[PDB]
């Protein structure tokens, strides 16, 4: 026999197959919740591969009897109770560096779509709006703004935020960031303005973009209180986590005009629909379905790394042989 490794919330293992064939038994559950997982997997499985569509609480984790390693195929690991997994002896790993520039490229696309109205102008043209005179060009593209001199505020200057910052310079954005965990010096090295409080960023930014991981202290970071601290007619971009923005507060802000437009790749409740939830047809909203990370290369890249992390777990030592373990402190 050889250790069982299961893909919890997927059906495809074609990319992982050549890396695990000889060291692990590969199965998949295609499960939305821990309820749909076969009793065998809970008892036998030593390894687990998962994405973002399944949440693992402390309850779910202590149903597993042989589980020693969880690898998240992708960056964020908020959907995994990493503290609880450490108590039980389960190492948690991620793949942080696979779709950094993909995400930054999609974020810049979102920013620009709000500023230049490319998506809404296409939408208008789809719906049979006729534009003849210069007067009606100005009318249909009303709100399109000049970028140079505008202030882009970045919340969380990690991998993605840093890549967004570099790209933003080229357009003429005045770039400032807020990151309470980075040590002094990053702002000087990259040549960016830095502010010390969230309100300070909100007060100065014409366009606010989110690039921080979802944690204990930042849930509903953009709420009823903090939305008011944002400038009149500011843009909001969120390609980080949906649980960071209060959708009820955002909706209200969009209708009243306090936020001129929003671009969302992530939402509080996924899958997203324009019919379901608080964002039920708020004006000036652009939404993509958690696809900012995607490209074939990035998808293969993270799956191969994830598969390699599994192999390192089975053959070598936990948590030594591991490369991208995110709960060494909880073990």
């Amino acid at each position: 026999p050889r250790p069982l490794v299961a893909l919890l919330d997927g059906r495809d293992c074609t990319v992982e197959m050549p890396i695990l064939k000889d060291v692990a038994t590969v199965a998949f559950c295609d499960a939305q919740s821990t309820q749909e997982i076969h009793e065998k997997v809970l008892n036998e499985a030593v390894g687990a591969l998962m994405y973002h569509t399944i949440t693992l609480t402390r309850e779910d984790l202590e149903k597993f009897k042989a589980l020693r390693i969880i690898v998240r195929i992708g960056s964020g690991f908020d959907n995994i109770d990493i503290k609880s997994a450490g108590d039980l002896g389960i190492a948690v790993c991620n793949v942080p560096a696979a779709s950094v520039e993909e995400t930054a490229d999609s974020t810049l696309c979102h920013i620009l779509n709000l500023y230049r109205r490319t998506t809404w102008l296409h939408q208008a043209l789809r719906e049979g709006t006729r534009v003849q005179s210069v007067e009606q060009i100005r009318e249909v593209a009303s709100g399109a703004a000049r970028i140079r001199g505008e202030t882009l505020g970045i919340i969380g200057l990690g991998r993605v935020g840093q890549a967004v910052a570099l790209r933003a310079k080229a357009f003429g954005f005045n770039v400032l960031f807020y990151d309470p965990y980075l040590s002094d010096g990053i702002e000087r090295a990259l040549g960016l303005q830095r502010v010390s409080t969230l309100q300070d960023l909100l007060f100065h930014s014409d366009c606010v973009t989110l690039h921080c991981g979802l944690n204990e202290h930042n849930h509903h970071l953009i709420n009823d209180f903090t939305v008011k601290q944002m400038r009149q007619g500011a843009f909001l971009v969120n390609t980080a986590r949906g649980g960071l923005v209060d959708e009820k507060a955002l909706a209200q802000a969009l209708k009243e005009g306090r936020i001129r437009g929003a671009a969302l790749d992530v939402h509080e409740s996924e899958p997203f629909s324009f019919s379901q939830g608080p964002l039920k047809d708020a004006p000036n909203l652009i939404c993509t379905p958690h696809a900012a990370w995607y490209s074939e290369q990035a998808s293969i890249e993270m799956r191969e790394e994830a598969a390699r992390e599994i192999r390192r777990a089975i053959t070598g030592r936990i948590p030594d042989s591991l490369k991208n373990c995110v709960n060494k402190d909880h073990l």
């Binding site: 703004a145 000049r146 001199g149 505008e150 909100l202 007060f203 014409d206 008011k228 601290q229 944002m230 400038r231 009149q232 007619g233 500011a234 306090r258 001129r260």
Partner: peptide
């Protein structure tokens, strides 16, 4: 500039 001051500061 283009944008105005926050509703409550």
């Amino acid at each position: 500039r283009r944008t105005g001051a926050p509703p409550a500061l």
